[PDB]
Amino acid sequence: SIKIKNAVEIEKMRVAGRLAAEVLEMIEPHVKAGVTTEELDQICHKYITEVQGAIPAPLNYHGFPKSICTSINHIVCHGIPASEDTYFGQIQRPAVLRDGDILNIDITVIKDGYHGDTSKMFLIGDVSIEDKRLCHVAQECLYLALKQVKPGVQLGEIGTTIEKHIKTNNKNNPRFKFSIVRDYCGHGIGAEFHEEPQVVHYKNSDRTVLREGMIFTIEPMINAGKFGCRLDDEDSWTVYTADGKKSAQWEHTILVTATGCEILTLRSEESLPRILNNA
Ligand code: NA
Structure with a gap:
């Protein structure tokens, strides 16, 4: 059944949404060539738990071994933070950022x-x-x-x-x-x-x-x-493009309003309104 959130639930979802966006804003200066996904995971985990007083959902509820998903290049989604590059047979399972890479960081925060x-x-x-x-x-x-x-x-x-x-x-x-x-x-x-x-x-x-x-x-x-x-099938999580080409993703959590939507996870850098009037 699809849930309609009441006013109290919408406010809690606004707080959770902002916290998830904040993690992405906080991590940006740490994201550069030669950093491991494991380091990014440690910094986000500590920020989420100690500064935000929130929970990383994947670690606690989804059976994910880490706090964030870090998907590089030909990884589509559910990349696992690590300290070393490994192989799934002949397929690279990267962990260390290089010049020329693209990285998706996927944040799921729970607050109250x-x-x-x-x-x-x-x-x-x-x-x-x-x-x-x-x-x-x-x-x-x-x-x-x-x-x-x-x-x-x-x-x-x-x-x-x-x-x-x-x-x-x-x-x-x-x-x-x-x-x-x-x-x-x-x-x-x-x-x-x-x-x-x-x-x-x-x-x-x-x-x-x-x-x-x-x-x-x-x-x-x-x-x-x-x-x-x-x-x-070795780590249960990492999803690769079948042809080894790159893949990119962007995600928002969104609230349907009377005339459009509200982007609960909007970041400060985005030239997109927080509230769209699509009517
Ligand atoms: Na990718």
């Missing part, structure tokens, strides 16, 4: 029983034009989906909007053609991490109607190659 879920891309040193375009177009996908959100809109319009943007990108930029990951989706979020509904990022005809008070994530994963993914 409510969740804030967000992620962003960081560009490490001099990143190629193709990697910049991938990160940029993935963020455009999130931002354009947000512009469609208001009461009465069918859920399928989110993925339909994202796929329309990627189709246009691919028609206009044959050198920088992208695909949408199909295996992972956004989701209702609140008192529980995984609530209804499921939010797919590709073209679909889901007729679920958005209502004021619903809270859910939009988190499109865009691949520089084909859409397919491969799960690390």
